[PDB]
Amino acid sequence: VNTVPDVNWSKHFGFSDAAAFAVLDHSKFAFDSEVVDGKRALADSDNNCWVNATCLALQFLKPTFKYVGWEDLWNKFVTGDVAGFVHLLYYIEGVDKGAKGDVESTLSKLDKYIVSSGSVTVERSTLCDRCNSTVKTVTGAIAEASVILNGHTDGHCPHNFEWRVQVIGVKGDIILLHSGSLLNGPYVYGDAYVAFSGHYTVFDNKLSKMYDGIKCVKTTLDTLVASSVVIRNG
Ligand SMILES: [Zn+2]
Numbered sequence: 001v002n003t004v005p006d007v008n009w010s011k012h013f014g015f016s017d018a019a020a021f022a023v024l025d026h027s028k029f030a031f032d033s034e035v036v037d038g039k040r041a042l043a044d045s046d047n048n049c050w051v052n053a054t055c056l057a058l059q060f061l062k063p064t065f066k067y068v069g070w071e072d073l074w075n076k077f078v079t080g081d082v083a084g085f086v087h088l089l090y091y092i093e094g095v096d097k098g099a100k101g102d103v104e105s106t107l108s109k110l111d112k113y114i115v116s117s118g119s120v121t122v123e124r125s126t127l128c129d130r131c132n133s134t135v136k137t138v139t140g141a142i143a144e145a146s147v148i149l150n151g152h153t154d155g156h157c158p159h160n161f162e163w164r165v166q167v168i169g170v171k172g173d174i175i176l177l178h179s180g181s182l183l184n185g186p187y188v189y190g191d192a193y194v195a196f197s198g199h200y201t202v203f204d205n206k207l208s209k210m211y212d213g214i215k216c217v218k219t220t221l222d223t224l225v226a227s228s229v230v231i232r233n234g
Contacts, residue, residue: 014067014113021091022069028097029090030083034214037207040078042086044213050101051086053200056211057107060192060202060230061175063141064115103194104177104228107142114141118172118231122146124154128161140174147178147193147229149186170231177228185221190229193221 006019013021031051032043039059042052055077065071070088077085092109095101119139126133138145146152151166167176167188176188187193193203195210202211203224210217210224 009069012067013069015092018069021088024087024091026083026087028083029086031086032214033080033082035080036211036214036216037204037209039211040080040082041211041214042082046098047100048086049199049201049213050095050103050106051089052211052213053103053194053202054089054106054110055085056202057103057175057192057194057228057230058110060204060232061117061141061173062232063110063117066113066115070113100199103200107175107177107228108144111140111142117141118170118174119143120145120167120174120176121169123166123168125164125166126157126161128157128159130159131157131161135168142175142177144179145176145188146180147176147188147226148183149188152180170234172234173230173232175228175230178226182225182227184225187221187226188229188231190231192230193224193226194228195224195226197224 009019009022010016031045031048033040039056042048065074073085073088089106093101093106116139119137120143121137122145124134145167146165151164154163154165156162191205195201195203197212203221205221208218208220210219
């Protein structure tokens with residue numbers, strides 16, 4: 001009779017069924033957390049490693065959210081009230097509590113809720129004399145691109161020349177989600193990498209440390225297979 005209208009929640013959160021999220025208790029998603037080297041990390045529990053990696057990646061990115069409700073739940077997350085933002089991730093990605101989710105799939109959905117912060121330029125080059133190399137610049141906070149330093153082949157033109165795809169520039173701040181099969185480095189340089197340790201971790205590339213839940217391990221990027229890279233001011 002006297003509730004916030006449903007369209008008020010949709011404006012607040014930016015998706016049409018937000019009232020159905022807003023009515024739900026979020027307290028089952030209040031995972032234990034600690035602040036480890038200045039960032040909020042979730043203790044490993046209930047297959048939540050994918051949530052920890054998503055939220056640590058976002059803290060390396062430093063996003064500005066487009067919608068007030070996201071901004072509010074994010075500010076609460078960083079100050080230690082984590083449940084609402086964590087539930088929001090399970091809700092948006094569509095993962096049962098207790099099941100594993102895919103970090104890159106989740107980050108990909110979050111792009112529309114975040115103010116654009118960077119751009120990535122990918123060249124698809126060929127030596128063919130009939131076909132032309134192409135260049136495409138994607139602008140956002142999260143974008144799909146090969147995270148392999150020297151690029152990768154991408155099939156052939158009909159004249160039998162290889163196409164090669166490669167990141168040739170990054171401006172601003174952006175997370176690149178790896179596009180193809182998982183491979184060893186060298187990787188495009190960034191501040192942090194989402195990686196596989198049999199589960200998700202996040203590697204800080206300036207401190208050379210790996211977050212595993214709330215634990216921290218000094219190790220090297222060479223020991224890891226990265227699925228995404230967080231790049232800051234180029
Ligand atoms: Zn050709």
